[PDB]
Design a protein around this ligand. Structure first.
Ligand code: SF4
Ligand code: SF4
Ligand code: SF4
Ligand code: SF4
Ligand code: FES
Ligand SMILES: [Zn+2]
Lengths: 86, 78, 694, 123, 118, 69, 77, 77, 61, 125, 48
């Protein structure tokens, strides 16, 4: 867990669960990439999936939580917790 | 009870899911000294040749031979 | 507008101006044909499509009669049956009795339609005998026996309309008509083999398949075409362990009935110069070895060498699955390494366009979108050598629509008018800001096609920045209905790689590696890989990367693994296994799991279903097979990836170079094919046969 | 009339699980009582308890099957096999099909982990 | 001839039996196995056996190159390998060869060649 | 009976009334190759050995090495 | 059966041949049948007095088909 | 490929010397049958053998099987 | 050979094609039989003229 | 759920149910021909197991096999029947949705239309 | 390869390729006489 090294966002394009995460991606991605300059940030979409994030710290240890929240801010804090709870 | 197939056969052959060759085969085991059933392995595999089946419809619709007493009547046009 | 009509009593609806035969197809009525192919222009020379229409006294040609409201059409009454028998009598007068030696036996339309719509016995016994004709020599790939021609003119129409090879024509007059090049020439086009699939009779036959097999013997399997990033669907035909041939399959959104010549004639490379056993290097020689011994040798090399962090390099080349690159990536990282890297020249560093959004490195406007195009721009790409099928689609659109094209690259001998206008970044900014910029703005469905050789340059950021500035600046290219920015990849692996990461991190980009696991890689240069490093090739063919290797581990080719391959559009397609991999060869991801276990790590999956659930955990569009998806993050994608981190690159003056110096002999399968050797000796511009003096 | 053989039961599809429970239990009881006959008639090289163990295994195989018709089919097939065995219709081979375990260990390497299957191309 | 086995030993075979046929040494097709690769892969079943008495028929590719070319007046030659001595067909289907081109041209069934008188 | 030459094996058998010794010339097959009659050598070393006229369909690669110049 | 499905008609000479060989076949079957009943009942001799007649009648088989017993002469159509 | 039989089905029968032989063919428009059951008279004969032999001694059982002269390749289909 | 089949001139195959003239396998469920009962047949009609009789058939279909 | 498990009464092995994959599909329209009769039927064919598909014999050159489903191909009238039969027998399946030719108008007149500007290409026929 | 197709027992096994003189010929022609039933369909199909 010496570092974050990769981030993967999964989300729908037009479903209901994913819109707050759509806003987070449209608005905060450059700030996320500057606050984590050494990490692959990956956004990958697919209709019908349940929005979710994956992180990879070191030696393949991957973490995960869903992002079925109702706000962009819940996304920020929830992402940040998963990034901290290495 | 079964009449054709082997006394311990497990399967029903003429089903379309049952492969031609079956699942088992028999040989003589010199060690055990017994005819023993083993999984199938063929020295020349089955070649179907049903993949050369015709791509054109071979025999079109036939010809009615219903007697007119059994044909559903056509109402007069008016 | 859709009309309505009657056909053998059934009623159907289709648009106006349509051919009657299309209506009949809609209504399921089977009608014969020789001269009519859906993707080609119409003609009426075979005269087998005749049907009776109450409006007209004679039978008329379904292939050409326009469809009209209220018309009634019979295809069963005695006149049609007689006319069909008569035509087939005439067709088979002067047809040689070559069926046993004709490679189309068992798959010839003439046999089937003579058995179904024709006479049991012929009345041509004449002593003067049948017409004869000589065989032409139009090159290695196409064998001719032109006594068998029925003069359908499918070949001519294809060549002159979809391919751009007008050397094929109709000489003579009357019964002495002869399809051919009037003098000895060669059918110079990368689409030449599709002619073979078009001829109904075996007057044009594949040569390296010439007599090897007959269709009833073959196991037809529906699979995917590596050798291009298009992902052209195909139909393989095996004879047990051997793969006899490849032929196309239908998919209107990708390949639409065509495939290139490389994909049809590289099969001959899957049965020669293969890897069947593991190998070890002990000096100048290789020594055959076991799997236990080589994997233990790899482990001892790891433990003796102690690579730390980003010293373990992973290289994935063209012709790789996505399961393999996933397993190689998870393993690499589990050893503490982020140096995953492509076999591209500048693969050591991360791409200029960024992998973050799929929209940045894909053919966004789908390949079915070129039909709707109005204006096009080609930057550093020769589509005739990268995805010929989409060059054919551009030409199909250029003929029947208003289309104006431009190019910024090496002057490319295209199958269409192109209006070349430079070879530098300077001319690129000039055109995009001068005239053709205005043409793209005032277009409704414009396209800006970038080659992947741009990604394989040191000054790629200077380009992708300018194109991104123009794209965001011009709405017509980027809207809520249309994304006219496109990256054309030339291999089937790069899109799947970028979809699962597989880009080097800048930290690893500067380390000099100690171990080098290179996967399907044969384009390496001997400079990317040091001397004192331990090297481990995985492949199915020994052409370049094996020669470097200290250890060589066989893999399987596309015909022997049910791999997933992602194409330029981002469409995921699943392959099928046609045969088992030969000898002591194994599926790749199994090899990487096992060596992983031999090393001080493991992967958490054991069988297929677990690898698939992993793929979904990496990216869920890798398990939406055949579905192409739109994307909502276009504006953001061009703002975050192309424009931002590329302002610091300065453009060079080095003029653009063609990415592919030879469409043949591009990858290992193809270099191992002697047919591509005969075809690269001929089909060269310097030969007289391949240039017409116009 | 063509009369039934010795231990023949008429095929009768019960409408309830509670009756088929009883019929299956009678079949199991008959197999157990007849196992020594299955050891005498077929020249067997192991124990009567091992036969009873295999019988218990074969009945535990389909212990968790709740569809009634499938249970009726299974019971009919089992009565067929009892009739085949107790009347000396089967020969030794068709009977020792049910006892692979008793025969000598087939070789050394019987893969159970991944790596061995990979070295033998069975994964 | 001395043929090296895979297992490092040698396989001695006399010259009359290594020829692909008594009239030709080389193979007449790329996939044809040469007699040396045959022996080298199958000596376990050839060991105590007599090679004189094994079937060694003549090759046709060399017996048909010996047959003289035939000539015709016209752009067609008709072939039908018919016996003309006994009843029935007994030959191969009629085939009209074009012979306008400068060289010889052979029937696809039989290899008999035809030329345009020059 | 394998020692009986052809022709006789058919005359001996009432397949024909005319023997190969008296059958006319045009009825005799023409041979571009010499005759050589060999009986059923079964049970003896000259028994027919079968083999594959083909070579393995999948030709492997004969290694050669390069140096990292 | 296959002609009844194909809805074709056999020519007359083929019908008469199929008839004649059907009755030659019924002779060849009744001989074996009756003269095996005998031998199982103990009378060895009528067997060998009849099998010669069978072997003269099988020459007709080898003449029309080529094979002595299993032949394949009669085919659909 | 062979010849394409029309779709349908038929049991057609004959007076075979053993009895009333028959074939139940089914067609699906292909050159290959979908089903073909040979009705074999020796089958029903042997099936009746239990009804026919009850009360009789073994020599008579021999004579009974001989009356039917079952050809067991037929009986086993 | 036989004459009308060896005739070379007026011997079309579509007249002596007895395979493609094969008689259809008729099928009659109770619906198709009650219509023959409530109504009649082409030989002995008992049906009303016009769209009335058409929907009369439809009531039984 | 409540789809019966006929796999228990089939008498067949369980390896088909636990390790083996099938594929359901329509045969693609061949490009070598223009017919379409071989289509319209939903075939079911097993996927290969690598080690035991085929291997060349030493003796005479024949191809061997151990996979017993290398030639079995069930034919169905529709997709739903196939899927039901597979689930009833417990087989795991992938569905291969077909790819149909896209309808576009075709006129003989487009061959002979006016070019107000430079001829794009010269037609032959 | 008509003999290979019509043969009921599938005894025959063939593999061809283009001969050095440009003709069609065989490199393998086998018969398993332990599979053969001696039907003569193979002498009937051959058009030569
Ligand atoms: S050469 Fe072939 S494709 Fe061209 S018209 Fe003749 S038969 Fe058709
Ligand atoms: S093209 Fe067709 S009809 Fe002509 S020889 Fe070949 S298989 Fe026969
Ligand atoms: S005659 Fe013999 S070799 Fe020929 S097809 Fe019949 S069984 Fe096979
Ligand atoms: S030419 Fe005769 S022997 Fe040769 S493959 Fe054809 S049918 Fe068989
Ligand atoms: S298909 Fe209409 S004449 Fe050719
Ligand atoms: Zn000839």
């Amino acid at each position: 867990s010496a570092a974050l090294r990769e981030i993967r966002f999964h989300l729908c394009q037009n479903g209901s669960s994913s819109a707050p995460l759509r806003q987070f991606v449209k608005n905060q991605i450059g700030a996320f990439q500057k606050a984590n300059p050494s990490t692959k940030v990956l956004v990958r979409e697919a209709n019908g999936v349940k929005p979710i994030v994956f992180a990879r710290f070191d030696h393949g240890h991957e973490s995960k939580i869903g992002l079925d929240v109702s706000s962009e801010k819940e996304v920020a804090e929830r992402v940040k917790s998963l990034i901290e709870a290495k | 009870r079964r009449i054709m197939t082997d006394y311990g056969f497990e399967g029903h052959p003429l089903r379309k899911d049952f492969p031609l060759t079956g699942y088992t085969e028999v040989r003589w085991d010199e060690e055990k000294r017994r005819v023993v059933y083993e999984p199938l392995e063929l020295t020349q595999a089955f070649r179907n040749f049903s993949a050369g089946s015709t791509a054109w419809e071979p025999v079109g619709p036939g010809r009615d031979d219903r007697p007119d007493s059994f044909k559903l009547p056509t109402p007069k046009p008016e | 507008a859709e009309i309505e009509l009657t056909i053998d009593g059934h009623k159907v609806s289709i648009e106006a101006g349509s051919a009657l035969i299309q209506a009949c197809e809609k209504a399921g009525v089977t009608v014969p044909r020789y001269c009519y192919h859906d993707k080609l222009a119409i003609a009426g020379n075979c005269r087998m499509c005749l049907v009776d229409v109450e409006r007209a006294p004679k039978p008329v040609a379904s292939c050409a009669y326009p469809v009209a409201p209220g018309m009634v059409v019979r295809t069963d009454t005695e006149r049609v049956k007689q006319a069909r028998e008569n035509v087939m009598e005439m067709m088979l007068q002067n047809h040689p009795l070559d069926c046993p030696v004709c490679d189309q036996g068992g798959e010839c339309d003439l046999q089937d339609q003579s058995m179904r719509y024709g006479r049991d016995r012929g009345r041509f016994t004449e002593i003067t005998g049948k017409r004869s004709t000589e065989d032409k020599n139009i090159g290695p790939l196409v064998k001719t026996s032109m006594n068998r021609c029925i003069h359908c003119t499918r070949c001519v129409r294809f060549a002159n309309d979809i391919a751009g090879a007008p050397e094929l024509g109709s000489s003579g007059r009357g019964n002495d008509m002869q399809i051919g090049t009037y003098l000895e020439k060669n059918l110079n086009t990368e689409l030449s083999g599709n002619v073979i699939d078009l001829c109904p009779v075996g007057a044009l036959t594949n040569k390296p398949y010439a007599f090897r097999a007959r269709p009833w013997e073959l196991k037809k399997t529906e699979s995917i075409d590596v050798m291009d990033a298009v992902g052209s669907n195909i139909r393989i035909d095996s004879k047990g362990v051997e793969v006899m041939r490849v032929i196309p399959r239908v998919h209107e959104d990708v390949n639409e009935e065509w495939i290139n010549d490389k994909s049809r004639f590289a099969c001959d490379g899957l049965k020669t110069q293969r890897l069947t056993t593991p190998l070890i290097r002990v000096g100048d020689k290789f020594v055959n070895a076991t799997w236990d011994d080589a994997l233990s040798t790899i482990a001892k090399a790891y433990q003796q060498k102690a690579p730390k962090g980003d010293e373990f390099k992973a290289v994935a080349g063209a012709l790789v699955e996505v399961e393999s690159m996933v397993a190689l990536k998870d393993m690499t990282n589990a050893l503490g390494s982020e140096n995953t890297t492509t076999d591209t020249p500048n693969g050591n560093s991360a791409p200029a366009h960024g992998i973050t959004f799929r929209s940045n490195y894909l053919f966004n406007s789908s390949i079915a979108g070129i039909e709707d195009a109005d204006a096009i721009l080609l930057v550093g790409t020769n589509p005739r050598r990268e995805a010929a099928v989409m060059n054919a689609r551009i030409r199909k659109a250029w003929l029947r629509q208003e289309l104006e094209i431009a190019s910024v690259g090496p002057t490319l001998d295209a199958t269409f008018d192109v209006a070349e206008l430079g070879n530098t970044h300077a001319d690129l900014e000039k055109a995009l800001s001068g005239e053709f910029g205005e043409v793209l703005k005032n277009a409704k469905n414009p396209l800006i096609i970038v080659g992947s050789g741009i990604t394989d340059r040191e000054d790629a950021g200077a380009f992708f920045n300018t194109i991104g500035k123009f794209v965001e600046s011009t709405p017509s290219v980027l809207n809520e209905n249309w994304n006219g920015y496109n990256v054309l990849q030339r291999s089937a692996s790069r899109a799947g790689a970028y979809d699962i990461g597989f880009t080097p991190s800048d930290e690893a980009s500067k380390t000099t590696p100690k171990m080098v696991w290179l996967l399907g890689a044969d384009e390496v240069a001997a400079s990317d890989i040091p001397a004192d490093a331990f090297v481990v090739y995985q492949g199915h063919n020994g052409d370049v990367g094996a020669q470097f290797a200290d250890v060589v581990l066989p893999g399987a080719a596309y015909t022997e693994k049910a791999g997933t391959y992602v194409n330029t559009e981002g469409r995921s397609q699943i392959s099928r296994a046609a045969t088992g991999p030969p000898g002591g060869a194994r599926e790749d991801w199994k090899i990487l799991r096992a060596v992983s276990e031999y090393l001080g790590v493991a992967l958490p999956y054991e069988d297929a279903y677990e690898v698939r659930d992993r793929l979904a955990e990496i990216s869920p569009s890798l398990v939406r097979y055949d579905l192409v998806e739109p994307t909502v993050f276009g504006d953001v994608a061009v703002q975050h990836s192309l424009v931002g981190p590329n302002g610091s690159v300065t453009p060079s003056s080095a003029p653009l170079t063609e990415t592919i110096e030879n469409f043949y002999m591009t990858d290992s399968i193809s270099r191992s094919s002697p047919t591509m050797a005969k075809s690269s000796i001929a089909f060269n511009k310097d030969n007289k046969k391949n240039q017409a003096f116009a | 009339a063509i009369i039934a053989t010795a231990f023949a039961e008429t095929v009768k599809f019960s409408g309830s699980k509670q009756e088929l429970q009883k019929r299956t239990l009678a079949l199991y009881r008959q197999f157990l009582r007849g196992a020594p006959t299955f050891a005498d008639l077929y020249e067997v090289q192991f124990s009567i308890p091992t036969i009873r163990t295999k019988i218990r295994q074969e009945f535990e195989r389909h212990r968790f099957v709740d569809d009634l018709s499938i249970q009726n089919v299974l019971y009919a097939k089992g009565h067929m096999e009892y009739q085949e065995c107790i009347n000396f219709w089967k020969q030794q081979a068709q009977f020792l099909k049910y006892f692979p375990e008793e025969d000598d260990i087939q070789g050394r390497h019987q893969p159970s982990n991944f790596v061995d299957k990979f070295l033998k191309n069975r994964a | 001839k001395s043929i090296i086995s895979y297992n490092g030993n040698t396989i001695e075979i006399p010259e009359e039996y290594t020829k692909q046929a008594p009239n030709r040494d080389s193979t007449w097709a790329p996939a044809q196995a040469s007699k040396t690769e045959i022996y080298k892969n199958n000596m376990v079943r050839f060991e105590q056996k007599d090679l004189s008495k094994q079937p060694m028929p003549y090759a046709g590719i060399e017996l048909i190159a010996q047959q003289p070319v035939r000539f015709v007046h016209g752009n067609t030659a008709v072939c039908d390998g018919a016996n003309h001595n006994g009843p029935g067909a007994q030959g191969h289907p009629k085939i009209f060869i074009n012979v306008d081109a400068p060289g010889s041209h052979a029937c696809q069934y039989c290899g008999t060649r035809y030329e345009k008188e020059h | 009976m394998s020692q009986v030459e052809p022709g006789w094996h058919f005359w001996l058998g009432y397949g024909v009334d005319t023997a190969p010794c008296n059958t006319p010339k045009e009825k005799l097959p023409i041979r571009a190759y010499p005759y050589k009659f060999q009986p059923n050598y079964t049970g003896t070393p000259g028994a027919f050995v079968t083999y594959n006229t083909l070579k393995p369909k999948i030709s492997a690669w004969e290694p050669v090495t390069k140096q990292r110049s | 059966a296959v002609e009844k499905l194909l809805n074709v008609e056999v020519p007359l000479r083929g019908k008469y041949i199929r008839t004649m060989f059907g009755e030659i076949t019924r002779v060849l079957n009744h001989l074996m049948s009756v003269c095996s009943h005998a031998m199982d009942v103990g009378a060895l001799t009528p067997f060998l007095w009849g099998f010669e007649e069978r072997e003269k009648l099988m020459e007709f088989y080898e003449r029309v088909s080529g094979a002595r017993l299993h032949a394949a002469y009669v085919r659909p159509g | 490929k062979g010849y394409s039989v029309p779709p349908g089905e038929t049991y057609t029968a004959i007076e075979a010397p053993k009895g009333e032989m028959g074939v139940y063919v089914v067609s699906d428009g292909s050159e290959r049958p979908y089903k073909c059951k040979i009705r074999a008279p020796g089958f029903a004969h042997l099936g009746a053998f239990d009804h026919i032999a009850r009360g009789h001694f073994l020599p008579d059982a021999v004579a009974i099987i001989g009356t039917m002269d079952l050809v067991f390749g037929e009986v086993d289909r | 050979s036989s004459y009308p089949t060896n005739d070379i001139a007026e011997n079309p195959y579509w007249k002596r094609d007895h395979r493609r003239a094969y008689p259809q396998t008729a099928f009659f469920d109770q619906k198709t039989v009650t219509g023959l009962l409530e109504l009649g047949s082409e030989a002995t009609p008992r049906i009303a003229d016009g769209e009335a009789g058409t929907k009369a058939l439809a009531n039984i279909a | 759920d409540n789809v019966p498990a006929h796999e228990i009464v089939s008498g067949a092995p369980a390896e088909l149910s636990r390790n083996r994959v099938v594929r359901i599909y329509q045969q693609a329209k061949p490009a070598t021909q223009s017919g379409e009769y071989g289509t319209f039927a939903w075939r079911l064919d097993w996927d290969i197991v690598d080690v035991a598909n085929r291997w060349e014999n030493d003796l005479i050159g024949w191809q061997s096999s151990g996979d017993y489903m290398q030639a079995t191909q069930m034919k169905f009238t529709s997709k739903e029947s196939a899927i039901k039969f597979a689930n009833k027998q417990g087989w795991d399946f992938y569905i291969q949705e077909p790819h149909h030719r896209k309808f576009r108008v075709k006129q003989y007149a487009n061959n002979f239309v006016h070019s107000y500007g430079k001829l794009k290409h010269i037609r032959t026929k | 390869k008509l003999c290979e197709a019509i043969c009921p027992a599938l005894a025959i096994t063939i593999d061809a390729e283009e001969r050095i003189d440009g003709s069609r010929r065989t490199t393998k022609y086998d018969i398993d006489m332990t599979k053969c039933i001696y039907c003569g369909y193979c002498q009937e199909s051959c058009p030569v």
